[PDB]
Hints:
- The structure is a homodimer.
- Chain A is of the alpha/beta class and about 325 residues long.
- The first copy, chain A, folds into two domains: about 1-125 and about 245-329, FAD/NAD(P)-binding domain; about 130-245, FAD/NAD(P)-binding domain (3-Layer(bba) Sandwich), CATH 3.50.50.60.
- In chain A, about 20% of the residues lie in helices and about 30% in strands.
- In chain A, strands 1, 2, 5, 6, 7, 8 and 21 form a seven-stranded mixed β-sheet that branches. A five-stranded parallel β-sheet of chain A has the order 10-17-11-12-13, covered by helices on one side. The first copy, chain A, has a three-stranded antiparallel β-sheet with strand order 14-15-16, with no helix packed on it.
- The first copy, chain A, starts with a strand and ends with a helix.
- The interface between A and B is large, with 55 and 55 residues.
- Bound molecules: flavin-adenine dinucleotide (FAD) (2 copies), NADP nicotinamide-adenine-dinucleotide phosphate (NAP) (2 copies) and sodium ion (NA) (2 copies).
- One NADP nicotinamide-adenine-dinucleotide phosphate (NAP) binds near residues 127 and 185 of chain B.
- Chains A, B: GO terms for molecular function: ferredoxin-NADP+ reductase activity; flavin adenine dinucleotide binding; NADP binding; thioredoxin-disulfide reductase (NADPH) activity.
Amino acid sequence: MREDTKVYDITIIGGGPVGLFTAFYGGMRQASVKIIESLPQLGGQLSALYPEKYIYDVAGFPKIRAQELINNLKEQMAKFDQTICLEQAVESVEKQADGVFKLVTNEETHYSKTVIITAGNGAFKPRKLELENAEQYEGKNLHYFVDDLQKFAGRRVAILGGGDSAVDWALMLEPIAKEVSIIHRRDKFRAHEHSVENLHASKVNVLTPFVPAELIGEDKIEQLVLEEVKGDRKEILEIDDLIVNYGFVSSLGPIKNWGLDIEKNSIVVKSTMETNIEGFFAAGDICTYEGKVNLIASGFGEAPTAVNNAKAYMDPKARVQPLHSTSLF
Amino acid sequence: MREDTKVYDITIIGGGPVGLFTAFYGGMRQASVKIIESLPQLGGQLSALYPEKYIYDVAGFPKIRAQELINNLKEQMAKFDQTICLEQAVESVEKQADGVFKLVTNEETHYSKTVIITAGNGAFKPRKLELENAEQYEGKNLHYFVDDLQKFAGRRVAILGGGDSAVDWALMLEPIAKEVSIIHRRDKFRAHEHSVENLHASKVNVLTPFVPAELIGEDKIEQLVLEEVKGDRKEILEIDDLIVNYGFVSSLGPIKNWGLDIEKNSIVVKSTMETNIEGFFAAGDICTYEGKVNLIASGFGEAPTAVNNAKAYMDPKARVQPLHSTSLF
Ligand SMILES: Cc1cc2nc3c(=O)[nH]c(=O)nc-3n(C[C@H](O)[C@H](O)[C@H](O)COP(=O)(O)OP(=O)(O)OC[C@H]3O[C@@H](n4cnc5c(N)ncnc54)[C@H](O)[C@@H]3O)c2cc1C
Ligand SMILES: Cc1cc2nc3c(=O)[nH]c(=O)nc-3n(C[C@H](O)[C@H](O)[C@H](O)COP(=O)(O)OP(=O)(O)OC[C@H]3O[C@@H](n4cnc5c(N)ncnc54)[C@H](O)[C@@H]3O)c2cc1C
Ligand SMILES: NC(=O)c1ccc[n+]([C@@H]2O[C@H](COP(=O)([O-])OP(=O)(O)OC[C@H]3O[C@@H](n4cnc5c(N)ncnc54)[C@H](OP(=O)(O)O)[C@@H]3O)[C@@H](O)[C@H]2O)c1
Ligand SMILES: NC(=O)c1ccc[n+]([C@@H]2O[C@H](COP(=O)([O-])OP(=O)(O)OC[C@H]3O[C@@H](n4cnc5c(N)ncnc54)[C@H](OP(=O)(O)O)[C@@H]3O)[C@@H](O)[C@H]2O)c1
Ligand code: NA
Ligand code: NA
């Protein structure tokens, strides 16, 4: 655990499209801004689930690719400064006796005058390996997210899963690692067929249809035991690193432990976007009210409403109504 | 007075940016849509009051010219069918005994299952010439809205006003008209400095500081008499056409007589965007609620909220939540 003692004006929970636009508007209102995001990148459901698909119902865009919209939002918010904390899932939020919010994640403790939660359906997290003692190896040689390929240089690597993530990493590691195995529970892969063709074409050891049965290693994982899906046959692999790419899940989880009023598995808001905790606002798919629609356009409307009301909360002489952007730049 | 006996699903009062996106969204939800707009053009405050200016706080646009955003919205809604009624200001809205809304304008009577008012600050009207016989010439050779500039080819034109609209028309007409004069009540123009420099360098006859004194003509205007401001001098122009560019005025006007709940020139809405009259919704600058900010982004979020709740009102079996646009097309 570490601690960032700087009190930010606005801390945003979740860097999907609504959080990104919220960050922009915080900058517009001369607020210091932190974004905390569960995944190793920004973009929420758009970047995670349909980055290549076209969106037709965002105002002003006859058609726009999801990732393109996210890229536009990043460019928009780049005019201002934020501190962005990726791979952090907020698990605790408490308004302290001095009014300052304290936020705790899996990695770091943060402070803020206001919090705006833009969590969607809750934190995106990788699917964990469902083997009794898998957690023991987290922080050692069990990897869920991969960034630096060179740490696997000259090493025996096993990758679990059959999607684009598992296949892509297997192909990138083949020329770097001593040996690479990919283990998937069907003979048919879920990854793009061309990537799967290259995989079979490559020197990657493909083990299908198998599931992980056991992890062995007192300290570091040393052996991986596989079991065939149809039948009882087992295989043991000697490995230096295990990468698990089983996709992602989202849930509210600890968002329900902060004293917020929750209805429809979402955070209730007044028309100002404020929750039942003053200084704590919500926007986008995480929020609810009578007539709420879960759309990007709706969230993009909620964002400035939240930021502008947050600004008035922080500075009772600040007008909720912003000045014209046409004049300000 | 004429009557359109077709009962529309959704009829939108005002074709500013929020009414345009509302109209698009109606199409998205497979509703029959009519837009009724007071001016001879769509675009609201953007097109009328700042078409040339860059907007920076619409989600997904690092910067977009106001008129270009309007153009984008028109392209977006062109995917579906709408009935557009320009040059019609709504004077009366009544929810009849059968539940059907009856809307009466200056030109026509309309019917609708639901109404979504997107009127901003009220119906735009051009500021008119305050001379006693001026109205007599409307529909003849006195012009408040100019579309077919070619019809001024080879003609003697006088333009009234000192803003960008007047100056732009003078400069655009100079190369094709026989003669162009611009008449303004101060030696200083309100138009942009470079345009004014172009104006003085051109062959346009600039008459300042003058106001119109008299229109002469039994049928069409044949002569325009001007008088110097704070002076003792008149001028008479022989003209074929008179264009007046005195800007725009807006007010709620008869919107206050429909039995709606109104505060501070705004229609009070609950979180569903519904007014106190069931089936009658509002969005954009016209609506209010605690925390409301008059922004384009805000209005763009309110629009689909209104449409989707109007859909649920018309068919309580149909859902509020739309299917994905990524999927629908
Ligand atoms: C296949 C598909 C197609 C779609 N098509 C459309 C469409 O065409 N038009 C449209 O308008 N909508 C569409 N949607 C819905 C749209 O994706 C959502 O409305 C939008 O993603 C909501 O944005 P958001 O920022 O509120 O939430 P999200 O996109 O879910 O982002 C929230 C972010 O918050 C992070 N987060 C959450 N909790 C925490 C925490 N505790 N700590 C740290 N980080 C956290 C999450 O990891 C996530 O990155 C579609 C959805 C799907 C799945
Ligand atoms: C100079 C200026 C700069 C601005 N800069 C920004 C900016 O940078 N960013 C931002 O977000 N916002 C900005 N705004 C505010 C922005 O223009 C408004 O939020 C936006 O125009 C509201 O859109 P609308 O569709 O609700 O209303 P409007 O734009 O007012 O359109 C309403 C339309 O309804 C019509 N109408 C009204 N009543 C009737 C009736 N009874 N019958 C028929 N038609 C009717 C009117 O003629 C009008 O065309 C600015 C405003 C101004 C004046
Ligand atoms: N280059 C690219 O275009 C690229 C790169 C990375 C990610 N993506 C996209 O990002 C999204 C995420 O994909 P990603 O692979 O992380 O995740 P994914 O598509 O969800 O794939 C997860 C893989 O894990 C397997 N799995 C899950 N739980 C398991 C379990 N309990 N036991 C055994 N196997 C299990 C699944 O098996 P089953 O298939 O049998 O269900 C699947 O093969 C996808 O849309 C993907 O296309 C694209
Ligand atoms: N090319 C561009 O960039 C462009 C193009 C079109 C519009 N716009 C913008 O759109 C906005 C609207 O401009 P627009 O020119 O329609 O309108 P405008 O700026 O309001 O100008 C109206 C002109 O009419 C004059 N006027 C009004 N009533 C009068 C009266 N009774 N007698 C004499 N003169 C009268 C005003 O005089 P005074 O100046 O003395 O008040 C003013 O010069 C402006 O911000 C403009 O910059 C920009
Ligand atoms: Na929700
Ligand atoms: Na208003």
